[PDB]
Amino acid sequence: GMSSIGLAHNVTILGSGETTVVLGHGYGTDQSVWKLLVPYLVDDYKVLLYDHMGAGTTNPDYFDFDRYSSLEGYSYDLIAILEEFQVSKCIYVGHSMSSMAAAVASIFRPDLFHKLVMISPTPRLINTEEYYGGFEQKVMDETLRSLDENFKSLSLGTAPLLLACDLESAAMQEYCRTLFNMRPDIACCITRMICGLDLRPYLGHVTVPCHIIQSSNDIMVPVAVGEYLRKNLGGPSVVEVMPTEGHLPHLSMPEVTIPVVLRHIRQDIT
Numbered sequence: 180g181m182s183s184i185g186l187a188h189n190v191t192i193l194g195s196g197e198t199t200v201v202l203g204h205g206y207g208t209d210q211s212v213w214k215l216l217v218p219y220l221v222d223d224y225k226v227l228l229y230d231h232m233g234a235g236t237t238n239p240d241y242f243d244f245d246r247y248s249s250l251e252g253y254s255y256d257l258i259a260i261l262e263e264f265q266v267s268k269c270i271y272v273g274h275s276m277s278s279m280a281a282a283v284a285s286i287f288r289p290d291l292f293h294k295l296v297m298i299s300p301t302p303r304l305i306n307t308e309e310y311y312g313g314f315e316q317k318v319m320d321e322t323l324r325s326l327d328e329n330f331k332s333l334s335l336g337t338a339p340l341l342l343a344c345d346l347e348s349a350a351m352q353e354y355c356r357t358l359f360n361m362r363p364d365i366a367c368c369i370t371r372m373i374c375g376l377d378l379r380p381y382l383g384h385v386t387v388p389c390h391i392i393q394s395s396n397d398i399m400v401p402v403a404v405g406e407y408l409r410k411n412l413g414g415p416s417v418v419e420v421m422p423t424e425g426h427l428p429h430l431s432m433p434e435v436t437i438p439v440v441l442r443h444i445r446q447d448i449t
């Protein structure tokens with residue numbers, strides 16, 4: 180039985196200030212992915228980092244396969260973490276999956292979020308006749324069907340294009356280190372859940388300001404998805420398309436991405 184929210188999510192606190200920046204790591208990583216951003220924040224902000232349940236650094240006995248088969252399970256966990264640490268009006272910075280979990284959380288508890296800074300978000304991968312997310316339903320169905328027996332070979336096969344980095348690069352090695360740190364059944368559950376998401380009906384209920392940061396070339400996120408988010412979110416928004424490639428530009432191209440993230444943390448939409 181989980182006795183401590185803070186220990187179960189490996190919560191880390193640094194820095195000081197009137198406002199707290201909360202960092203969410205996204206699929207396949209853990210809070211270590213933020214290591215180069217944090218030093219630029221601590222003089223001005225309190226910083227809270229956490230690992231989402233099912234990351235390889237978390238206890239698999241706490242992974243509830245029912246709750247984490249939908250994104251809102253993560254949203255409700257995030258609310259509990261913020262409440263446990265008495266955080267409100269935070270600046271939430273998240274990579275893709277985490278940023279969308281925070282967007283959903285912000286509908287239920289808008290008081291906990293001053294703004295969202297979202298790296299590579301998408302509300303839905305699967306195409307419809309009117310919405311282009313980049314992925315055909317039937318190809319997704321068959322790829323997920325054999326995911327269990329192919330998890331490593333598929334993940335290794337796509338990761339260089341996903342990250343826009345060479346197989347032997349430091350970014351590839353680091354991403355694979357944390358990705359394969361998940362227990363395989365947990366990894367497959369999270370993968371199936373995020374591939375199946377449709378958050379389009381939630382967007383109009385999101386009212387907190389959203390800063391959307393995108394790579395110019397991201398195989399998971401067409402540039403049109405950033406514009407879709409801008410038009411369909413219920414509050415203020417801004418979209419920045421960076422001269423980067425890859426779905427995790429904060430990991431693979433920090434020299435461009437870190438200054439961009441810092442600007443959106445520091446500057447509110449006017």
Ligand SMILES: CCOc1ccc(CN2CCN(C/C=C/c3ccc(OC)cc3)C[C@@H]2CCO)cc1
Binds near residue numbers: 206302322337338
């Ligand atoms: C035409 C190509 O079809 C494909 C269909 C399937 C895959 C399998 N990939 C899909 C992506 N998986 C990570 C999910 C990221 C993500 C991020 C935000 C989000 O927000 C809704 C949803 C998902 C890894 C998984 C195995 C390694 O490749 C690849 C290609």
Ligand SMILES: [Mg+2]
Binds near residue numbers: 382
């Ligand atoms: Mg809409």
